[PDB]
Amino acid sequence: GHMEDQEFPNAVNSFTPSVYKEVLKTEKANFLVSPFSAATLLALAQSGCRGDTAEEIRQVLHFVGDREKAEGAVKEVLSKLTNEEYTLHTANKIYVKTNFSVREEFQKIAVEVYGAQSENVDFSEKNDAAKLMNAWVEEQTQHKIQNLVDPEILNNLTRVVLINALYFNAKWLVPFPPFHTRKSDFHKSAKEVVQVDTMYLDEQYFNYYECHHLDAKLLELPFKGGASLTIVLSNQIEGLVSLESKIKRSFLPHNLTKQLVNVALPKFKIESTVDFKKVLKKLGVKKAFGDEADLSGIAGEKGDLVISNIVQKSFIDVSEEGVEAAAATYIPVSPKQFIVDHPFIFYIKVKGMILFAGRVTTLN
Length: 364
Prior knowledge:
Blueprint: H1 8-26, E1 31-33, H2 35-47, H3 51-60, H4 67-80, E2 87-97, H5 104-112, E3 117-121, H6 126-140, E4 160-171, E5 182-187, E6 193-211, E7 216-222, E8 228-234, H7 240-245, H8 247-251, E9 257-266, E10 268-275, H9 276-283, E11 307-318, E12 322-323, E13 336-339, E14 344-350, E15 353-360
Parallel strand pairs: 2-3, 4-11, 9-13
Antiparallel strand pairs: 1-15, 2-4, 4-12, 5-6, 6-7, 6-9, 7-8, 8-14, 10-11, 14-15
Helix pairs in contact: 1-9, 2-3
PDB class: hydrolase inhibitor
Keywords: Serpin, Serpin48 inhibits SPE specifically, SPE, hydrolase inhibitor
Assembly: monomeric
């Protein structure tokens, strides 16, 4: 990012499993989360904070000290997540209590550096505020993400709200042939099975790895432009919890090599809404949410504003052409087996950086 001494891409990757472990606590089935995107929003917040407040956020993001560096670093990653071959869509905003006019300097850095914006809003009228924020999110996500803010979360004390909506769009480098898509067994556990739409791709060379410590297999499915979707598949039907007790190892980079493989991957769609205040509190951000809070870089004086809520909403829709891809039309000219037919972890990487992570434990 800024080069005097990458370790921002690296900080996100270590942040990722910590976030996953927290989200698990409240999510009981499938989920999707972007630790990366949340991280860039919180970094925006951090820039408007001061003293121990801002320093804490820095500590938890295990982000770098210098502000030209932090800002430059985040500015670089965000600029690259726009490709000819794939696009990350984000609607990130920091809405602030009307009483305290947002400093123009902060609204500017939001746009110029952190791919977000900031705006004053009256939280008094709960439902108008909610609608306003949600309508903005809809316009910015082509109406794909709706009702992000539940007006019930708003109250007389709402001071600063972080909104973080996103979704990813990419094409498989080697798409699945839809003719071969069929209903097949998916084992949610030993005792229960279901029939769900499953896609099939044979005799392809994909990055593959057998992790012996984890008793799992890993497969990296390539997107056009260098992005990828990585599945972490336990060798045993009910082995997911095990992988989650060792969640750190599951996201670590491995010596993946191209092996000849057949793949059976269910189609899946997931929508998640994540309370990142809850997450960040367990990870070490305390001051910014309470009385000692210092958001004077955003507006007002110390103690006027606190971060009241942090809400991420995202979805993923996995199909034959890729993710959030419309049905096109295509034709082409003793393999390892990668049959994804029980619960698994997945994650999307771009240029070595994890963008999204999640799990599927249930399908229909």
